[PDB]
Structure 1
Amino acid sequence: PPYTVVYFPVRGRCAALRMLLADQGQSWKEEVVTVSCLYGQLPKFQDGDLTLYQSNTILRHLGRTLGLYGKDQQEAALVDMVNDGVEDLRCKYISLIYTNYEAGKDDYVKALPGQLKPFETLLSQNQGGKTFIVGDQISFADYNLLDLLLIHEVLAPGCLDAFPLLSAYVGRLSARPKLKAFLASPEYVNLPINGNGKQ
């Protein structure tokens, strides 16, 4: 395969790009790192002899090369705006999981709905929330947002009950045939979400 994902045996920052690859029928190899790198971190991603680091770099690159970055330049910017919002919330989530889980979790969950609402609002403005997060075609931001929502449902079950378009969106994206099969597969299910047992 021309694609290789080098990462810890976790879903982590590779979950979204993996969903993307699975859903667009792409083949890739997984290289596992048990407990060199430009920024001293994984994921590392190979596409032929191109070596990328940074999960969002990988998403944008797949977004550009597989046509999942909007239909024009304005949509592409909106895709970025969504992904940057997803990543802002991910940065807080990761800090929680890895540096303040037991003490911060109740404060984090309190603030959660106000950090989710912006995505509900975006959906409500795009064809009634019935298609994708931007435009009428799936983008890399949809896979990343989907992941973010899936991992938050585990952290704070019901956190989407207050948000009907986000709820239906998750169920709708999750039932895409190729993606539904992947999320059910051992390759996905048998990895933990993070690398410290907390979720």
Structure 2
Amino acid sequence: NIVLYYFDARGKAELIRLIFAYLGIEYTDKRFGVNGDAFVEFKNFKKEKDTPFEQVPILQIGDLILAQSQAIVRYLSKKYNICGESELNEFYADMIFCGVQDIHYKFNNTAANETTFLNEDLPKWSGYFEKLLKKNHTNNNNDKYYFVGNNLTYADLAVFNLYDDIETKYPSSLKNFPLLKAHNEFISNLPNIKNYITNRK
């Protein structure tokens, strides 16, 4: 019953694919442009499906059409208990995801200006996450890194996906941030996540 529609790219779909992998949820991963014309296939999709904003990702669960990648993430995270276990932890997971969006946007919008990115913004943002993880030190041992409380949240997956994307371009980016480094390794090594990354294009 579940179909995720996106272009043939990680981008705005990949966090949702990571959540379904973590959760072991079966779905069809529909990708426009894998073979044919992405724009033609997308245009033909918009004809057949009622989308609210003529954008993807779209997640269809039975007859229910959901749009807006962040809103899908939040909905799924709430339904499947990866959103934090207190009103404050839920807020913190959301705050951290929102910060991931700021720096992921900068990464995505270059990086033609890469020295400023490489020397100023990326280190600075990395330090912000390093400090957030330090604050949660505190639930551990064991091991257990999480951004928020004592259990995985979508904020863990989002920060993983951010630095997974960054490391593809800039391999040494986590050398100066050992907590953030340990976090990324911890997440990448979760059975369902490791499995998914192995299978992935």
Same fold (TM over 0.5): yes
Matched residue, 1:11: 10
Deviation at residue 153 of structure 1 after TM alignment: 1.1
Q: 1:127 is paired with a residue of what secondary structure?
A: coil
Q: Which has the higher contact order (CA 8 A, sep 6+)?
A: 1
Q: Which runs of 5+ in 1 are unaligned?
A: 191-199
State the structure with more CA Rg. Answer: 2
CA contact (8 A) 1:17 1:144 kept: no
8 Å contact from structure 2 (residues 134, 179) kept in 1: yes
The TM-score, its normalising length taken from structure 1, stands at: 0.85
Answer yes or no: is 1:56 the counterpart of 2:70: yes
Checking the alignment, whether the CA contact within 8 Å between 1:17 and 1:143 is kept in structure 2 is no
Question: Contact (CA 8 Å) 2:145, 2:182: kept in 1 or not?
Answer: no
Q: Distance in 2 between matches of 1:183 and 1:32?
A: 17
Give the whole-Å Cα distance in 1 for the aligned partners of 2:177 and 2:6: 33
* Equivalent residues of 1:83, 1:144 under 8 A apart: yes
Q: 1:40 to 1:107 in 2, by over 3 A?
A: farther
Question: Structure 2 length normalisation: TM-score?
Answer: 0.85
What is the CA-CA distance between 1:127 and the residue it aligns to? 2.1
What is the match of residue 30 of structure 1? 29
Alpha-carbon shift at residue 182 of structure 1 (Å) = 0.7
1:67-106 pair list within 5 angstroms:
67-96=81-110, 101=111, 103-106=112-115
2:64 and 2:114 map into 1 onto residues whose CA distance is 39
Percent of aligned pairs sharing the same letter: 28
Offset from partner CA, 1:99-122 (integer Å, 9 cap, x none): xx4x31222112211011111001
Counterpart residue type for residue 119 of structure 2: K
| Pair 1:109 & 2:118 matched | yes
Any gaps of 5 or more consecutive residues in structure 2? 39-45
